[PDB]
Design a protein around this nucleic acid. Sequence first.
RNA 1: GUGCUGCUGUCUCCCAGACGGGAGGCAGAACUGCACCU
Length: 787
Amino acid sequence: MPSYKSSRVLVRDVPEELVDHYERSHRVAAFFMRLLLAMRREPYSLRMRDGTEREVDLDETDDFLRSAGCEEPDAVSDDLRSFALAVLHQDNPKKRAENCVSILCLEKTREGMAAALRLRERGVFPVSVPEHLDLDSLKAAMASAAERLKSWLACNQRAVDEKSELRKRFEEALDGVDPEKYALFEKFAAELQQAKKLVLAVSAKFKRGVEILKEDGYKPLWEDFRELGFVYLAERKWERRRGGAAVTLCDADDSPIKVRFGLTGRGRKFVLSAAGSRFLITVKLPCGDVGLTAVPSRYFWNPSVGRTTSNSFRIEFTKRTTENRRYVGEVKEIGLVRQRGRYYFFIDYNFDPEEVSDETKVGRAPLNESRPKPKDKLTVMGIDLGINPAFAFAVCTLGECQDGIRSPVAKMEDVSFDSTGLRGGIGSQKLHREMHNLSDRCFYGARYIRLSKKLRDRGALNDIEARLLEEKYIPGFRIVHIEDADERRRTVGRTVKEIKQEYKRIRHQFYLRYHTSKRDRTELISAEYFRMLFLVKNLRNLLKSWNRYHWTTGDRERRGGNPDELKSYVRYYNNLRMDTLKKLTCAIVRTAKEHGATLVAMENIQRNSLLSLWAPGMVLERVEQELKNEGILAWEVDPRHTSQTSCITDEFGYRSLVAKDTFYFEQDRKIHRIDADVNAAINIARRFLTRYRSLTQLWASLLDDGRYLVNVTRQHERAYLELQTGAPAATLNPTAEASYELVGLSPREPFYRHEGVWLTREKHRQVHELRNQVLALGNAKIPEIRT
RNA sequence: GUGCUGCUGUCUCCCAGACGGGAGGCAGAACUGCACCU
């Protein structure tokens, strides 16, 4: 329920009577993770600092459990597995039985705990802990290891789901059709792999890949290269996929974990005191205590601490920012992480968000559903998550209208989108451009290395290889091609060094942005962060390729267990990702608070873009959390044609593929232009405000009679017809002007609204005529409206 | 304090193989700017 924040403080001269504890905690955590990864004998792939993954066998698991202390782990495997599953959150919550250590390491109903009791009275349970430690430290280490195993089992279930989906998609392709001829097609593949884009290249039932099939060697079927080839592709995809989620062990110097402390008994207790602008930490080990001088931290400039009746340490501090800002909260746990030698005390705490009145929550549903209205003069703000703009914004006060873009709303008067603009644009006409250039250069070199590897090993293997060489990579790497291999290798090295130097140049110019006399005018966020994120993400691969060029193409294994390869760049990229996400968070909160932003709409990006740099959901989740922590109540919105339709005429439009930021629409038989980003911002606000009263896409199928039937997936679609047609379903009947309409029904091709004539996929793709018209009339002649 | 996030001199280990890269330790200066549970 409550939220969280956390920051680190550094203790410099640490006593050894705690460094030993750190080491033993790491040891016991690793052993516990292996014990719980073996209690279920399903094998898996693992790895170490090496990075290349060995594979276990069930015999290894048997011997491991034997070393634990069991004699016939296979014989009693049932209770062990049940206890393990009940421990690591594998099962559903009601079957859910750090809290296990009191049953595990002791010497003197849900199936997990009953199984543990059986395993003990059965004479099997008590395992031999490799190292001596106190019970609370065992609890903390089990907590860490179990959390990591929880992540692993979640990811393993995910991989299982992925492989199941691949298998089902392949099955729907084969569907048992002509299995013998399928084997014949596999025999054809035998030559193909020795002699999908090819399947698309076979467009007509008319180059050795496309010449051999005509010959009698594989003529005898010739049936159709849609059924023939899709099945092979799906089988190949199901063949090539990792089905399990690997594991990394926890290593003090390679895979560190946090050594946690807190008053709640999840580790040794603690006392936090402050004096002289710095924290002082005392931890009650079984051997006594220790005094550690947490170096003063700007996150805790002038702090203080205080005990509470809630068994928590209340603190208060001032965070260095553009101004002096105040914070408070309750501290309940601390964590020790030894990164590159220095001991850091992680500080954790809860803190209240700012107050919210239910007049916000009420406003914060489908048109087929009726619920009360705001009944309050709140302000709705637009957020358009993107790349070039961090968030295009527009805020229009409901219960008021002065001037601007007039946008209707569901069952209330018109609102006006007056305050508009962009946040997070390019901080330089040159820096972002150069940075994007370098990122693309990396993306292309990282493949030309493989291309030259194959060419050196075997020579030109086919035509499309040379076509790509001359078309995409050679210009993406801008190097001279040399027939010999030695000079080509040295040219690869030269270009690698040049990319290094350009990375240094960019990195140095980009660090000075926050120190030179221009400090004040440097924006909080900008597209520069995202573009240099892309640059690092692709430079990592370019180098990782340059580390593996000396060896041939057919290899598959590491030549030596050299750890910590390119980990500096990985750490840089990840720290940057965290910082940039925080900065976008801060920019959104700042641009939202001043305007009020009592309700915020942000497109559901989940349906060279945000999805690449982050997992699809983390951006939205953390943005909702941060905006929540401030008292604001954000909200997500479907983006489907929110970026191609118009916000003044409610009709589809053209988002210029070349003028990427501009959008075009026509009103009153006149052509008008607008900033596509602000446009979108509006349309998302419009959809939030109007309860999605104007659909623009429908998928309909046909079976007979020559007329299609609408589909029913999301309640909003079901409400659209009931509002426009009057029946819960309808059909796409024809009309003279090569278009459709909706005339209901009585007891899946594209279709798009336009004016209501519903020009389908082909005729919809009218939008090209709009493009031709708007291009022919000249952009400079077009009205540009408030932006 | 963690990062953004650095730089210049120097010191060492690994991969390569005369082009290059990877990983860390110190020591100087420049500047005190921007965010901060992964």
